[PDB]
Design a protein around this ligand. Structure first.
Ligand SMILES: COC1=C(OC)C(=O)C(C/C=C(\C)CC/C=C(/C)CC/C=C(\C)CC/C=C(\C)CC/C=C(\C)CC/C=C(\C)CC/C=C(\C)CC/C=C(\C)CC/C=C(\C)CCC=C(C)C)=C(C)C1=O
Ligand SMILES: CCCCCCCCCCCCCCCCC[C@@H](O)O[C@H](CO[C@H](O)CCCCCCCCCCCCCCC)COP(=O)(O)OCC[N+](C)(C)C
Ligand SMILES: CCCCCCCC/C=C/CCCCCCCC(=O)OC[C@H](COP(=O)(O)OCCN)OC(=O)CCCCCCC/C=C/CCCCCCCC
Ligand SMILES: CCCCCCCC/C=C\CCCCCCCC(=O)OC[C@H](COP(=O)(O)OCCN)OC(=O)CCCCCCC/C=C\CCCCCCCC
Ligand SMILES: CCCCCCCCCCCCCCCCCC(=O)OC[C@H](COP(=O)(O)OCCN)OC(=O)CCCCCCCCCCCCCCCCC
Ligand SMILES: NC(=O)C1=CN([C@@H]2O[C@H](COP(=O)(O)OP(=O)(O)OC[C@H]3O[C@@H](n4cnc5c(N)ncnc54)[C@H](OP(=O)(O)O)[C@@H]3O)[C@@H](O)[C@H]2O)C=CC1
Ligand code: SF4
Ligand code: SF4
Ligand code: SF4
Ligand SMILES: [Zn+2]
Lengths: 62, 156, 208, 114, 341, 96, 144, 176
C-alpha cells in the first residue's frame, strides 16, 4: 500500500477537452424554492451546474 | 432536331434499363432491416420490380441505409458507398437514417446518414412499413426516369 | 382482495433472511451488510477486496451453488467518496434462487477480475471499464468493447455530457470521415420534472 | 493514507513504464505510416507521439501515470492490429479543425467565448 | 447588417457565418473545394448548375440542413443570373472550360458570362464579387484561353469596380488537370516535351491554399477592389517537374523532344473528340508557357495563407497512378525536385 | 383569409413574413411557400352566438367524448358574451 | 378442365373492352382480372372488388391517365387516391364512400393532392414566429 | 415437464436396416424435399399487386401527423404542450402567445419527422384531439428539409385527411 502526498486530480483521465476543463466555472448551490408552489422538497440536495454559454437561432426552422 | 431526337431516345433507353434493374446492396443495420426482409417477402415481392439484393458493393446500384449509423460504423458505410461503382443512389430508410431518430442526442450516433453520403430518397417511419419502403423505391425509379444525361451533354 | 397491490411472500422473505445470516456468519472478514428488499431480493455488501473469496464461496459451496453470473454492472454516484458501485447478479439453479453482491471503488482503485470464477465476467468487466473507467487487475484482455476506436472519456459517468464532445462527418477536402467538436442544430431541451411535494414518507431522510 | 497501487509503487517505476511505452510508440510510427498509407512524414508521426506524451507531463500521481500508460498501451494495440482505420490515426492530427484564435482581441471580435 | 446576417456560433457546421454566397461553376474542382470551405464555416451557399442534378450530389453533404440551395441557370440568361444572385451578398465566379464546345467558346465562357454575372450582380446590389482569372492572363498571349482571360478580367473590373480578381498559377490537387495530365502520358509511350521542357518555368499552387485564399478574400474588408496572384513557394523547370511527377508515381520516365508544330498538330488531333478532350492546342501552349512573375501583386502570404510546397501534397495526387508494387511506398522515398529560385 | 406582404409573399395566420432585405427568402425561389388558406380566427368569428336562458351553461365542443373537457361559462355580464376558451364559442343570455 | 380455364381467360380478354383494353390493362397495371365496379371518384380512378380472391387481393384500383395537371398514364403513385377511397382500399372499413359518404366540412380540401416532392409545388419549411428582438432605429435627422 | 427432442435409437432389424440403406443409396428424403417445393410451385402466390392493391390496415394505424379543427373551423390545439412534454424523441417544438381575439393558440408548431419515432404518445396526451397520427404513410420526400413539418404543413395535412381521420377516430374512440 503506497502513500501519496498529492491532491487528487483526474482531469487527464476524464477525457474532457482542455477548453472545457480550464474555462468553466461551475456553481455549487442549493436550488431556490419555486415561488409558485409552497413545497420545499426540491431544496434539499446541492446542485452543481455550469455557466451559461451562447445559444443562437437556427437559420432553418428557427 | 435529329440529334436532339436521337439523344432523347437513347437516354430514355438508358434510363429505362437503370430504372427497371435496381440491385440494392445487402446492407442492413438495425430494426429497419426487418422491414426490408418483409419487402423481399412474398407479400410485397420486390423481385417483381427488378429489385434484387447483391452482396458485393461492386455489383449494387442502390444503398438502402436502414438503421442507426453510429460513429464506429460511419467509416464502413462511407467505404462501401465509395466502392459502389457509378451511377449509384442512396435511400435512407427510417428515422435513424433520416435524422437522428430516437438517438438524435447521443454521443455515439451520427445525426443523419446524409452527413456521410449523398442521399437521394428519404423514407420516413420507425420503421417504415414495407409498402412505404416500396413507395420509396418506386419514387426513386420515377426520379431516375427524369435524368437526362445525354440531353445535357448534347447541349453541353 | 386488494386487486391493485402486489401480494407479498413472507416465506421467501424468511428464507432469504436466513441465508443472508448464514453467509454473513460464514464470511465475516469481507461481508459488511446484508439486506432483504420487500420484494424478496437478497443483497450483500462486501469489502471490495473480498470479491474473489465471496464469489468463489457463492459458486462452489454446496449450500450456495450460484453457478450462473446473470449480470455485472456498475452505478456512478458522484456524491460518494467511492463513486462506483460494482454489482454482481448471481443465479442458483439448484435452489432456484438469485443473489446480489455489491462492492465499491473509485477512479484509481482497481478491482480484482472475476474471470477466474465466471467466464462472462470477461466481457462484462470490459464493458464496465469502457463505460466507467474502472480498472480490473488480472484481466486476460482489457480494452474498449462498445465505444468507438480512440474514443476519449467514459460515457456512462454522470459528469459526461449526453451528446459528448465530438461528432462525425465526411469532409470532401480530406476524403475521409473527420471528428469535430459537437454542435447541435437544436439543443436538447432539459425539463425540470420533480414535484416539490414529498411523495413517499416511508423513505424520508432525517433533516440532519 | 495508504492506497492500493495499480502498478509501479513509487514514481520511478512509473517513469520506467512511461519510457517503455514511448519506445514502443517510437518504433511503431514507420510501420503505421506504411500500413495505413498515411500522407504524413515519419517525423510528423514521431512529433505527434512526442506531443501527446508531453501534454501529460504535469502528472505527479503514480496511479494516474499507470492509468495513462495502460490507456496508451490500449491505443497502441489498436494501431498494431490495424483495428483503427486511417480515419482515427488522422483524427489525432485535427487536419480539418479551423484554428481557434487565442488572443483577447481576436476572441473579442469573434464572439462571446471567454 | 441585417439581423439574420450577424455571425453566431463557433464557426462550425451548425453556426451562422453571415455569408450568403452564390458560387458559379461550383460543380467542378475549385468549385467543390470552395463550396466545402463555405459549408464548413457555416455559410449559406447557392449553387447554380446547368449539368445533370446527379452530378451535383457530392455537394449535398458539404453544408447543414438548408445551407445548400441548388438552382438552375443558363449563362446566356440574365433572368436566371438575377434569380441566382438576387439574395446573396457574395458572388464567386469560377466558370471556365479548358476547351471549346459547339455552343460555347472561350469568348463566351471567359468574357461574355463573367461580364453578365458582374453586370447583374451590380444591379442586384451584391456587396462582394470574387472573380477567378489566370496568372498568365496576357492580351497578346499566344493562347486564346489567356487572351479571353485578360479581356474578361478587364470587363469584370469595368462592370463591378469593387471586385477581387484572383489569379492562380496552376492548381494541383486530387481532381486537377496538371499533375494528372503529366502523369497520364504513360499510355502514349514516352513523354513528349517541347525543347525537352528546359525553357519552361512553373510554380504550381495547391488547391486547398487557393480555396482558403478565396475564403479569406471574402472575410478581409481590405481586399474589396484588388488583384491577387496565388502562386506556390517554389519554381520548377518543366523537365524537372515532370521527372519528379514520374518519380513519385514510380513510372519509367522516357522524355523526348517534340517540335512545337508537331505538338500543335498532335493537339489538333486530340481535340476532335466530342467528349472532354485529352489535350488541345491551347492546352499545349499553356503547358509550354512559363509562369509570369508578378512581385507587385499581393498573394497568399498577404491573405494570411502559407503556401503548401508540392513535395508535401504530391503523394496525395500521384499515389493513385502507382502500381501494386509501389502503392505502399512512403512520402520521403523520393528526393525533392531541383528548384529554380 | 390570406394576406400578401409588400414583397409579394403570403402572410401566415401567425403574421410570419420575411422582410424585404431578409436573405432567407432565397429558399422560396423556384419553389412555393406553405401557407394554409383557412384562418381559424376568421371562421370562429363567422360562427354565430348561441342564446340560452340560463345563468350558467356548459360546453364540451360537440361530440361528447370526442370534444374537449366540459367547462361551464357564467353568463352574468350583459356587456359581453361568455366565451368557451377551449373552442372559442360565444354564448349569451336573451336580453331585452 | 383446361377448356374452362381458357374460356375464363377469353372472357377476361373480352371483359376489358376488346383486345386493346386488355393490352392497356396488362401494360399499365400488370393485372388482367375482372371485378365488380364499386365506384369511381372525381379524378378518374376506378375501384373494383372481388370477394372470391384471398384477403388483400379482394379490392383493387385502376388509376387514371391524368390527375390534376400531370400525365399519369405510366407514372402511377400510391398516393393518387383521395382519403375516403384510401380508407376503403386499405380496409379500415367495409363500407365504400358511395355507400357511406364521409362527413363534409367547409375546411376540407375539395381537390386531393399527391406527393409533390421534386416539383416546384414542394413544401419548404420556415420559421413561423416573428422577430424576438427589436433593434433601435437611429434618428434620421442630423444633430449637434 | 420436459421432452427429449432427439433421444430415439433406430431399430436394428433387417427390414429397417435395408430401409435405411435404401434411403442412403436412393435419395428418398431429398426427393421428399423436391416434392414439397413442387407443391409450393403449384400453389397460389401470396403477392398483392401494389400499388393497385394495398395491405390491410386498422383504425389504430400511426402514420403521418395532422392537426385537426373543430367542425366550426377553429383549431383544436390550445398550446397546452402536453404532447411536447410527453414526446419521447423531443420531436415537437411549440411556441404560443395570446391571439388577437384573446384565445390561447400556437404561433409555432414544428414536428421533425426525421426525429419522430411514430409512437403515438402525442395523440394519447392531447386533451382535445388536436394532434393525431393520420392514416397516410406514403410521404417520402427527396430532401431532408421537406420532412421538417411546420404548423401550416400539419394544418394542410389535417384539412386534406380530415374525413378519413374523423372516421378512424369514430371507429376507435370507444377503446381509448
Ligand atoms: C442485409 O440484410 C438482409 C436484407 O436487408 C435487410 C434482406 O432483405 C434479405 C432478404 C433477401 C433474400 C432472402 C434474398 C437476397 C439474397 C440474394 C443472394 C438474392 C437471391 C436472388 C435469387 C436467388 C434469384 C434472383 C436472380 C439473380 C440474383 C440473378 C441476377 C441476374 C443477372 C445477373 C442478369 C444479368 C445477365 C444477363 C442479362 C445476361 C446477358 C445478356 C445477354 C446474353 C443478351 C445478349 C443478346 C444478344 C447480344 C443477341 C442480340 C441479337 C439479336 C437479338 C439478333 C441480331 C441478328 C442479326 C443477324 C443482327 C436478407 C436475407 C438479409 O440478410
Ligand atoms: C440485351 C441485348 C442488347 C439490346 C440493346 C437494346 C435493344 C432494344 C432494347 C429494348 C427496348 C425496350 C424499351 C421498353 C419500353 C418501356 C416499356 C414501357 O412500360 O415504358 C414506358 C415508356 O418508357 C420510357 O418512356 C422509354 C423506354 C424506352 C423507349 C424506347 C427507347 C429506344 C428504343 C429503340 C432503340 C433501341 C436500339 C438502339 C440501341 C442499340 C413507361 O412505363 P414505366 O413507367 O417505365 O412502367 C412503370 C410500371 N407501371 C406502369 C406498372 C407502374
Ligand atoms: C439423368 C437424370 C438423373 C436425375 C437424378 C436426379 C436425382 C434427384 C436430384 C436431387 C439430388 C441433388 C442434390 C443431392 C446431392 C447430394 C446427394 C447425396 O448425398 O448422395 C450421396 C449419398 C449420400 O451419402 P452419405 O449419406 O453421406 O453416406 C456416407 C456414409 N459414409 O451416397 C451415395 O453415394 C448415393 C449415390 C447413388 C448410388 C447409386 C445406387 C447404387 C445401387 C446399386 C444397385 C445396382 C448395382 C448394379 C449391378 C447390377 C447387378 C445385376
Ligand atoms: C499508343 C497507345 C494508345 C493509348 C491508349 C490510351 C488508353 C486510355 C488512356 C487514357 O485515357 O489517358 C488519357 C489521358 C487522360 O485520360 P484519363 O486516363 O481518363 O484521366 C482521367 C480523367 N478523368 O489524357 C492525357 O492526359 C494525356 C494527353 C497528353 C497528350 C500526349 C500527346 C503525345 C502522344 C502522341 C505522340 C505522337 C508521337 C509521334
Ligand atoms: C440505326 C443506326 C444506329 C442507331 C443508334 C446509334 C447509337 C447506338 C448506341 C451506340 C453506343 C452509344 C454511343 C454514344 C452515346 C452518347 C454518349 C456520350 O457521349 O455521353 C457523354 C455524357 C458524359 O457526361 P458529360 O456531359 O460529359 O459530363 C462529364 C462528367 N461530369 O453522358 C454519359 O456518358 C452518360 C452515361 C452513359 C453513356 C453510355 C451509354 C449511351 C447509350 C448506349 C446504348 C446502347 C448500349 C449497348 C450496350 C452493349 C450491348 C448490351
Ligand atoms: N484549374 C486550374 O488549373 C486553374 C484554373 N483557373 C481558372 O479557375 C476557374 C475554375 O477552375 P476549375 O475548377 O479548374 O474549372 P473546371 O473546368 O474544373 O469546372 C468548370 C465549371 O464551370 C462550369 N461551366 C463550364 N462551362 C460552362 C458554361 N459554358 N456555362 C455554364 N457553366 C459552365 C462547369 O459546370 P458543368 O460541368 O455543368 O458544365 C463547372 O462547374 C476557371 O475559370 C479556370 O480557368 C485558373 C488557374 C488554374
Ligand atoms: S428508425 Fe426506428 S425501426 Fe428504424 S432503425 Fe431506428 S429505431 Fe429501428
Ligand atoms: S408519435 Fe411519439 S415520437 Fe412522434 S411526435 Fe408523437 S410523441 Fe413524439
Ligand atoms: S397536446 Fe394537443 S392541445 Fe396540447 S399542445 Fe399538443 S396538440 Fe396542442
Ligand atoms: Zn367549448
Amino acid at each position: 500500500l503506497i502513500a501519496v502526498d498529492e491532491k487528487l486530480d483526474i482531469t487527464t483521465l476524464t477525457g474532457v477537452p482542455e477548453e472545457h476543463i480550464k474555462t468553466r466555472k461551475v456553481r455549487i448551490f442549493v436550488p431556490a424554492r419555486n415561488n409558485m408552489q409552497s413545497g420545499v422538497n426540491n431544496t434539499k440536495k446541492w446542485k452543481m451546474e455550469f455557466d451559461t454559454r451562447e445559444r443562437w437561432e437556427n437559420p432553418l426552422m428557427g | 432536331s435529329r440529334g436532339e431526337y436521337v439523344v432523347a431516345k437513347l437516354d430514355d433507353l438508358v434510363n429505362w434499363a437503370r430504372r427497371s434493374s435496381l440491385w440494392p446492396m445487402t446492407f442492413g443495420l438495425a430494426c429497419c432491416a426487418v422491414e426490408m426482409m418483409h419487402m423481399a417477402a412474398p407479400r410485397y415481392d420486390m423481385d417483381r420490380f427488378g429489385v434484387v439484393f447483391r452482396a458485393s458493393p461492386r455489383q449494387s446500384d442502390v444503398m438502402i441505409v436502414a438503421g442507426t449509423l453510429t460513429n464506429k460504423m460511419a467509416p464502413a458505410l462511407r467505404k462501401v458507398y465509395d466502392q459502389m461503382p457509378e451511377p449509384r443512389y442512396v435511400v435512407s430508410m427510417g428515422s435513424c437514417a433520416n435524422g437522428g431518430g430516437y438517438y438524435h442526442y447521443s454521443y455515439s450516433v451520427v445525426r443523419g446518414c446524409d452527413r456521410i453520403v449523398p442521399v437521394d430518397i428519404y423514407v420516413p417511419g420507425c420503421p417504415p412499413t414495407a409498402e412505404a419502403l416500396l413507395y420509396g423505391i418506386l419514387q426513386l425509379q420515377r426520379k431516375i426516369k427524369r435524368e437526362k444525361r445525354l440531353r445535357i451533354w448534347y447541349r453541353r | 382482495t386488494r386487486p391493485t397491490i402486489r401480494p407479498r411472500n413472507d416465506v421467501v422473505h424468511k428464507q432469504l433472511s436466513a441465508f443472508g445470516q448464514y453467509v454473513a456468519e460464514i464470511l465475516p472478514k469481507y461481508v459488511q451488510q446484508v439486506q432483504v428488499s420487500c420484494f424478496n431480493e437478497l443483497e450483500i455488501f462486501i469489502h471490495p477486496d473480498g470479491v474473489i473469496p465471496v464469489l468463489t464461496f457463492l459458486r462452489d459451496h454446496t449450500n450456495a451453488q450460484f453457478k450462473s453470473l446473470a449480470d455485472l454492472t456498475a452505478v456512478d454516484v458522484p456524491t460518494r467518496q467511492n463513486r462506483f458501485e460494482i454489482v454482481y447478479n448471481l443465479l442458483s439453479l439448484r435452489f432456484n434462487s438469485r443473489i446480489r453482491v455489491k462492492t465499491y471503488t473509485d477512479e484509481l482503485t482497481p478491482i480484482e477480475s472475476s474471470v477466474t470464477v465466471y467466464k462472462a465476467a470477461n466481457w462484462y468487466e470490459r464493458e464496465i471499464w469502457d463505460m466507467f473507467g474502472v480498472f480490473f487487475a488480472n484481466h486476460p484482455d482489457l480494452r474498449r468493447i462498445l465505444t468507438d476506436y480512440g474514443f476519449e472519456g467514459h460515457p456512462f459517468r454522470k459528469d459526461f455530457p449526453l451528446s459528448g464532445y465530438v461528432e462525425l462527418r465526411y469532409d470532401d477536402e480530406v476524403k475521409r470521415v473527420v471528428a469535430e467538436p459537437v454542435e447541435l442544430a437544436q439543443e436538447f431541451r432539459k425539463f425540470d420534472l420533480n414535484s416539490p411535494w414529498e411523495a413517499f414518507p416511508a423513505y424520508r431522510q432525517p433533516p440532519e | 493514507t495508504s492506497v492500493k497501487p495499480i502498478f509501479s509503487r513509487d514514481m520511478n517505476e512509473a517513469k520506467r513504464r512511461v519510457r517503455e511505452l514511448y519506445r514502443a510508440w517510437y518504433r511503431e510510427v514507420p510501420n503505421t505510416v506504411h500500413l495505413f498509407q498515411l500522407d504524413i512524414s515519419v517525423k510528423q508521426g514521431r512529433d505527434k507521439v512526442r506531443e501527446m506524451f508531453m501534454k501529460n507531463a504535469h502528472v505527479t500521481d503514480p496511479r494516474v501515470v499507470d492509468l495513462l500508460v495502460i490507456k496508451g498501451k490500449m491505443e497502441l494495440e489498436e494501431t498494431i492490429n490495424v483495428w483503427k482505420q486511417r480515419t482515427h490515426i488522422m483524427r489525432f492530427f485535427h487536419e480539418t479543425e479551423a484554428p481557434r484564435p487565442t488572443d483577447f482581441l481576436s476572441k473579442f471580435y469573434v464572439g462571446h467565448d471567454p | 447588417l441585417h439581423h439574420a446576417l450577424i455571425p453566431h456560433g463557433k464557426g462550425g457546421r451548425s453556426s451562422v457565418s453571415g455569408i450568403v454566397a452564390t458560387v458559379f461553376g461550383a460543380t467542378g474542382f475549385l468549385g467543390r473545394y470552395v463550396v466545402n470551405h463555405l459549408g464548413r464555416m457555416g455559410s449559406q451557399v447557392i449553387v447554380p448548375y446547368r449539368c445533370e442534378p446527379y452530378d451535383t450530389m457530392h455537394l449535398r453533404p458539404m453544408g447543414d440542413l438548408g445551407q445548400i440551395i441548388f438552382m438552375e441557370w443558363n449563362g446566356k440568361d440574365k433572368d436566371s443570373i438575377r434569380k441566382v444572385v438576387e439574395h446573396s451578398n457574395v458572388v464567386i465566379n469560377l466558370v471556365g472550360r479548358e476547351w471549346e464546345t459547339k455552343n460555347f467558346d472561350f469568348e463566351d465562357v471567359f468574357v461574355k458570362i463573367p461580364h453578365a454575372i458582374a453586370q447583374v450582380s451590380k444591379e442586384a446590389g451584391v456587396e462582394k464579387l470574387i472573380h477567378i482569372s489566370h496568372l498568365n492572363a496576357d492580351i497578346k498571349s499566344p493562347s486564346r484561353y489567356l487572351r479571353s482571360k485578360a479581356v474578361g478580367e478587364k470587363e469584370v473590373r469595368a462592370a463591378f469596380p469593387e471586385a477581387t480578381i484572383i489569379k492562380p498559377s496552376d492548381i494541383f490537387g486530387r481532381e486537377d488537370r496538371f499533375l494528372n495530365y503529366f502523369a497520364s502520358m504513360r499510355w502514349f509511350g514516352g513523354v513528349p516535351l517541347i525543347s525537352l521542357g528546359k525553357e519552361t518555368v512553373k510554380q504550381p499552387v495547391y488547391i486547398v491554399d487557393v480555396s482558403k485564399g478565396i475564403i479569406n478574400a471574402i472575410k478581409d474588408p481590405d481586399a474589396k477592389g484588388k488583384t491577387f496572384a496565388f502562386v506556390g513557394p517554389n519554381r520548377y523547370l518543366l523537365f524537372d517537374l515532370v521527372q519528379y511527377i514520374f518519380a513519385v508515381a514510380y513510372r519509367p520516365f522516357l522524355p523526348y523532344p517534340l517540335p512545337h508544330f508537331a505538338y500543335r498538330w498532335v493537339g489538333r488531333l486530340f481535340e476532335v473528340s466530342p467528349f472532354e478532350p485529352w489535350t488541345t492546342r491551347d492546352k499545349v501552349e499553356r503547358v509550354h508557357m512559363s509562369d509570369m512573375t508578378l512581385p507587385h501583386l499581393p498573394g497568399l502570404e498577404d491573405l494570411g495563407i502559407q503556401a503548401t510546397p508540392l513535395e508535401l501534397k504530391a503523394i496525395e495526387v500521384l499515389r493513385r497512378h502507382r502500381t501494386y508494387r509501389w502503392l505502399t511506398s512512403e512520402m520521403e522515398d523520393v528526393k525533392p525536385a531541383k528548384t529554380v529560385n | 383569409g390570406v394576406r400578401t406582404s409588400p414583397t409579394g409573399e403570403k402572410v401566415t395566420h401567425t403574421g410570419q413574413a420575411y422582410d424585404d432585405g431578409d436573405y432567407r427568402r432565397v429558399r422560396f425561389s423556384d419553389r412555393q411557400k406553405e401557407v394554409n388558406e383557412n384562418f381559424a380566427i376568421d371562421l370562429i368569428a363567422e360562427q354565430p352566438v348561441s342564446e340560452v336562458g340560463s345563468r350558467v351553461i356548459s360546453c364540451d365542443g360537440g361530440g361528447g367524448a370526442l370534444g374537449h373537457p366540459r367547462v361551464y361559462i357564467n353568463l352574468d355580464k350583459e356587456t359581453k358574451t361568455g366565451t368557451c376558451g377551449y373552442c372559442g364559442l360565444q354564448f349569451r343570455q336573451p336580453h331585452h | 378442365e383446361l377448356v374452362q380455364v381458357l374460356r375464363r381467360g377469353l372472357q377476361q380478354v373480352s371483359g376489358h373492352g376488346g383486345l386493346r383494353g386488355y393490352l392497356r390493362v396488362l401494360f399499365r397495371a400488370n393485372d388482367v382480372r375482372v371485378g365488380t365496379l364499386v365506384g369511381e371518384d372525381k379524378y378518374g380512378n376506378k375501384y373494383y372488388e372481388d370477394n372470391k380472391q384471398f384477403f388483400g387481393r379482394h379490392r383493387w384500383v385502376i388509376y387514371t391517365t391524368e390527375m390534376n395537371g400531370r400525365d399519369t398514364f405510366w407514372d402511377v403513385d400510391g398516393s393518387m387516391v383521395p382519403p375516403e377511397w384510401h380508407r376503403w382500399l386499405h380496409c379500415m372499413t367495409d363500407d365504400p364512400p358511395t355507400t357511406k359518404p364521409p362527413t363534409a366540412r367547409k375546411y376540407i380540401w375539395t381537390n386531393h393532392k399527391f406527393n409533390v416532392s421534386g416539383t416546384p409545388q414542394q413544401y419548404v419549411p420556415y420559421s413561423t414566429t416573428r422577430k424576438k428582438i427589436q433593434e433601435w432605429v437611429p434618428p434620421s435627422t442630423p444633430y449637434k | 415437464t420436459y421432452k427429449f427432442v432427439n433421444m430415439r435409437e433406430p431399430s436394428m432389424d433387417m427390414k429397417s436396416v435395408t430401409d435405411r440403406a435404401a434411403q442412403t443409396l436412393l435419395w428418398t428424403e431429398l426427393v421428399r424435399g423436391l416434392g414439397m417445393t413442387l407443391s409450393y410451385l403449384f400453389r397460389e402466390p401470396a403477392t398483392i399487386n401494389y400499388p393497385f392493391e394495398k395491405g390491410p390496415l386498422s383504425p389504430r394505424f400511426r402514420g403521418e401527423h395532422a392537426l385537426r379543427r373543430y367542425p366550426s373551423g377553429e383549431e383544436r390545439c390550445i398550446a397546452c404542450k402536453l404532447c411536447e412534454a410527453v414526446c419521447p424523441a423531443q420531436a415537437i417544438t411549440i411556441e404560443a402567445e395570446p391571439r388577437a381575439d384573446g384565445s390561447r393558440r400556437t404561433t409555432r408548431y414544428d414536428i421533425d419527422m426525421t426525429k419522430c419515432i411514430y409512437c403515438g404518445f402525442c395523440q394519447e396526451a392531447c386533451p382535445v384531439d388536436a394532434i393525431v397520427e393520420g392514416p397516410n404513410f406514403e410521404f417520402s420526400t427527396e430532401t431532408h428539409e421537406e420532412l421538417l413539418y411546420n404548423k401550416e404543413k400539419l394544418l394542410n395535412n389535417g384539412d386534406k385527411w380530415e374525413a378519413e381521420i374523423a372516421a378512424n377516430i369514430q371507429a376507435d374512440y370507444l377503446y381509448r
